Amino acid sequence: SNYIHIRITTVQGVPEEYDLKRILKVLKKDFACNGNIVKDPEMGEIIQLQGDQRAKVCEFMISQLGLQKKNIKIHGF
RNA sequence: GAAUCUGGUCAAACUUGGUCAUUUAGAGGAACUAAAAGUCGUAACAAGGUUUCCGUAGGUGAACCUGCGGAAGGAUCAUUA
Ligand SMILES: [Mg+2]
Numbered sequence: 001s002n003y004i005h006i007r008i009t010t011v012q013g014v015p016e017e018y019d020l021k022r023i024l025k026v027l028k029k030d031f032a033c034n035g036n037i038v039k040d041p042e043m044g045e046i047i048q049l050q051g052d053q054r055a056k057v058c059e060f061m062i063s064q065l066g067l068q069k070k071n072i073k074i075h076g077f
Numbered sequence: 078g079a080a081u082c083u084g085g086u087c088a089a090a091c092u093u094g095g096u097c098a099u100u101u102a103g104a105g106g107a108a109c110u111a112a113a114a115g116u117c118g119u120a121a122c123a124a125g126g127u128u129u130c131c132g133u134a135g136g137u138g139a140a141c142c143u144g145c146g147g148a149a150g151g152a153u154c155a156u157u158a
């Protein structure tokens with residue numbers, strides 16, 4: 001499990017090993033985009049940032065906790 | 078009357094530390110300019126769509142905004158109508 005995907009952009013599937021508000025704090029400044037933590041009931045926790053920066057989202061997910069980079073399959077869309 | 082030699086004096090330089098100045102590398106940290114077809118907001122110029130700006134304090138992705146006290150560079154020189 002623990003699958004993660006990015007859909008035009010929301011990130012569905014996020015490990016809980018670090019606090020969410022600091023993730024938002026680093027995200028907004030390193031992307032320069034509006035950031036939302038939307039907690040829909042019992043779906044993959046929603047973190048939404050504007051623009052088409054999936055390469056930059058890759059950079060962020062590498063720089064936050066990511067060390068696998070193999071279960072990430074971003075849908076183009 | 079030479080070498081030698083006791084004392085001193087001027088005293089170069091050496092040995093060792095201390096001192097600062099001038100250059101010099103130095104991981105990395107931190108900017109600042111030009112670069113104008115990246116990025117996300119649209120802060121400011123009109124009542125900039127919440128009036129602007131200053132000092133001060135806080136929080137915040139940013140341009141900010143909020144509090145307190147100021148000013149007109151205000152959008153009023155004016156209610157003894
Ligand atoms: Mg002598």
Ligand SMILES: [Mg+2]
Nearest residue numbers: 108109110111
């Ligand atoms: Mg530079």
Ligand SMILES: [Mg+2]
Nearest residue numbers: 050051116117
């Ligand atoms: Mg944009």
Ligand SMILES: [Mg+2]
Nearest residue numbers: 119120121125
């Ligand atoms: Mg505006």
Ligand SMILES: [Mg+2]
Nearest residue numbers: 120121125127
């Ligand atoms: Mg304004």
Ligand SMILES: [Mg+2]
Nearest residue numbers: 124125126127
């Ligand atoms: Mg308004």
Ligand SMILES: [Mg+2]
Nearest residue numbers: 130131149150
């Ligand atoms: Mg002036």
